[PDB]
Design a protein around this ligand. Structure first.
Ligand SMILES: CO[C@H]1O[C@H](CO)[C@@H](O)[C@H](O)[C@@H]1O
Ligand SMILES: CO[C@H]1O[C@H](CO)[C@@H](O)[C@H](O)[C@@H]1O
Ligand SMILES: CO[C@H]1O[C@H](CO)[C@@H](O)[C@H](O)[C@@H]1O
Ligand SMILES: CO[C@H]1O[C@H](CO)[C@@H](O)[C@H](O)[C@@H]1O
Ligand SMILES: [Ca+2]
Ligand SMILES: [Ca+2]
Ligand SMILES: [Ca+2]
Ligand SMILES: [Ca+2]
Ligand SMILES: [Mn+2]
Ligand SMILES: [Mn+2]
Ligand SMILES: [Mn+2]
Ligand SMILES: [Mn+2]
Lengths: 235, 235, 235, 235
């Protein structure tokens, strides 16, 4: 089955499957049940920015989410990604809606990956500060589309700008990413994306994710709403 | 047919199809007949480095090739790549052998591409300082292989290290590259690679190329030897 | 005397000292009389962005200035900066006002410099996306201040936000920049800055400059208004 | 007094002041007595590479040191550098010798620093892959010299290539570095350097350091040998 590592911007408390009782950011290691969460004060309709960082020396996967002028939310978890993920992965963003909804709009997305073994590390770096209708270097899955106002729309939003329920969508970068190998000395990656989460009715759902998966990964069956498009069950 | 822009490290004078009468670097715009060439003193069996640069403001495509301690060879040509290439391309290295031969060994390859329209340019950057036997982010065509001594071998070299005749090989980066669009303000790219050209008998052939092509490009039929794997005829 | 290379955003036609009869961008090589100019439609009070690029292979210094949704203005000039500038320089922004005025406000400023001689080039890169009141890595000269709304104010603006006449100001990066040497193979630099030019009365003056100078350079006497803070006379 | 954070490549066991009884890498937080050490198998006369990384989200300062083909040594320590260092610092390398000696030769040194508050982080990046006799962007202190074989020699080495006793030397980058501020959201830095440690007699001393200090820092009196040029006492 897929091997998934993710940072989840979890907008909807699913307390029956281990969510804390408040919107949160979490680190997910091959399970929707986050290994660590921090309370996240989502600001409806504002543009937020997420930064994620890892290196094989410290073996600490960190994420921070912030809005303008507001306090940040940070979460970290000590995990040896070398032992967890395959040597070759694809990187991506995912989002879902359920009975409740939200725009899962991505305004920009940047990613850097380095793999060392003399400074001769191998590196991959990409930055989308703007998305075009034909984004050939993105693999779109599910309901995700590109082009609308130069944005990446992970979940189904009707033409009026209203978000739809029970949507799922993902975008993976086209090239595969080399994140470890047998001989490896140091590896590190770094990811950032700006997002816009708007929900009209009382509360939004279900969230946005930055994730790392085996190269052939696609939306698992049953992965909607609270499973953020990454996992088939809630184990 | 393919749309090809290339910088050729032309090791073998094909004077009957417009080569100058000496090894040369050239800028090729949709023809093997270089728009501009400079004399290039190849040093058999040495490691050389090539740097290529372009931006849409100056509209000048430049290349320099150098060996340690030795004088460099530089060539430039004013060309509006916006008007010449498609908006989406793939980037690559090619090499051939003919009746004469050479190792077309690539030790490293780095590439940067930026596309602007606030500093929010889109960017792609990759660096192979080392090639592994399974290089999933490279599309190998023809006789090109990866892994041997951490190198990219574009043309057929027998296990002993001897180069074979009438070989052709190319490697293109897996992700497509966005190099222009309708709205574009500025675009630029930058490429560098280290290569090792060894030939035992008197003189080598045929050369190495860095090239930019339509995404679906493959080795055209009839493109061996003097056509460096890029062109079907010598027009 | 100082050795100055600059890209000038010349907002005020000084036709008596060789300006064209319209606001323009220009390339200045040790003289205020631009070696090449392009017509520039300044948009009062809008945020514009300038990109400048050079490399020692093509020997073509280019600049582009653009505003949102509007056509760009581009200018290029073939010049061998190796032969023109000293091996060690400082890089900076300058601006002036005269009898007419303008805000010469800098919102961001990024600069990259590379010097090569194996990919072992030397490099300097800095980015100010925000300026703080105590910007210790900037050398402020003349009327330039830092901090106001996170901006760099090159020329005197009164506390109300109104620009003052006969101001001059420059900011140079604190570290010296190594842009060539005897052994050099390739060198290149790249600079970008976002600026805000507002003038209330009919027309603004005098302009903004990105420049490269000998390390000890300061505002020459007599360099105000039309001499943009770079040159003592109009030769 | 100076505020010092450093990663020490400690070649000589000073067990009387808390060193483990073997050469080690350590993380030093305002004391020569390392907060954490790892055993380091130094290879006399080989070229080694050190990588150091920190970010304000994970608050984990990591270092790895490796030689070709050999196992690496890694060390980490959870420390909130925001609370420890001043907002403005200088970054540098230091080295010493004592009764025993070693070449403290630096072949290359690269450093990246980012400070965020939209992707508009402030950044400083420099890379010396080669040092020239007149390195104007380095502040040399003590016995450190630049130019010899394109290398940075931190401690006194006689013209023959033999290392001298009771030497001390440091090099700091010329520009000050902005590593935090009141408004800050995220900060991170990253440093790498290649070094050559050769000692003829039985064992070398005393070590090499990458350090971060208040901008005006200089070699404290009494800081030789085992105090690696950073600290006046061994507290
Ligand atoms: C009733 O719950 C549904 O709606 C919530 C919120 O959208 C989801 O978390 C969940 O998976 C279901 O799809
Ligand atoms: C006889 O010519 C052949 O050999 C030379 C040198 O290899 C090639 O340039 C050419 O295309 C042919 O294949
Ligand atoms: C009368 O001219 C003055 O004003 C213009 C416009 O500001 C400047 O160009 C010039 O140098 C003088 O200072
Ligand atoms: C006797 O000790 C001296 O020599 C060792 C090894 O060089 C140093 O650690 C120490 O500071 C002294 O200078
Ligand atoms: Ca949830
Ligand atoms: Ca030829
Ligand atoms: Ca003028
Ligand atoms: Ca010691
Ligand atoms: Mn959750
Ligand atoms: Mn040719
Ligand atoms: Mn002018
Ligand atoms: Mn120690």
């Amino acid at each position: 089955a897929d091997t998934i590592v993710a940072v989840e911007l979890d907008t909807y408390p699913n307390t029956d499957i281990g969510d804390p009782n408040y919107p949160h950011i979490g680190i997910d290691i091959k399970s929707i049940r986050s290994k660590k969460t921090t309370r996240w004060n989502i600001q409806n309709g504002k543009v937020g920015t997420a930064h994620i960082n890892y290196n094989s020396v410290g073996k600490r996967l960190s994420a921070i989410v912030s809005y303008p002028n507001s306090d940040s939310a940070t979460v970290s978890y000590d995990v040896d990604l070398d032992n967890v993920l395959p040597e070759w992965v694809r990187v991506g963003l995912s989002a879902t809606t359920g009975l409740y909804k939200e725009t899962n709009t991505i305004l920009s997305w940047s990613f850097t990956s380095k793999l060392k073994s003399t400074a001769d590390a191998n590196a991959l770096h990409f930055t989308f500060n703007q998305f075009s209708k034909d984004q050939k270097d993105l693999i779109l899955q599910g309901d995700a589309t590109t082009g609308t106002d130069g944005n990446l729309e992970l979940t189904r939003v009707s033409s009026n700008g209203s978000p739809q329920g029970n949507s799922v969508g993902r975008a993976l970068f086209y090239a595969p990413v080399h994140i470890w190998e047998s001989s490896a000395v140091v590896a590190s990656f770094d990811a950032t994306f700006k997002f816009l989460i708007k929900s009209p009715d009382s509360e939004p759902a279900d969230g946005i994710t930055f994730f790392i998966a085996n190269i052939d990964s696609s939306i698992p069956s049953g992965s909607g709403g609270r499973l953020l498009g990454l996992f088939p069950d809630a184990n």
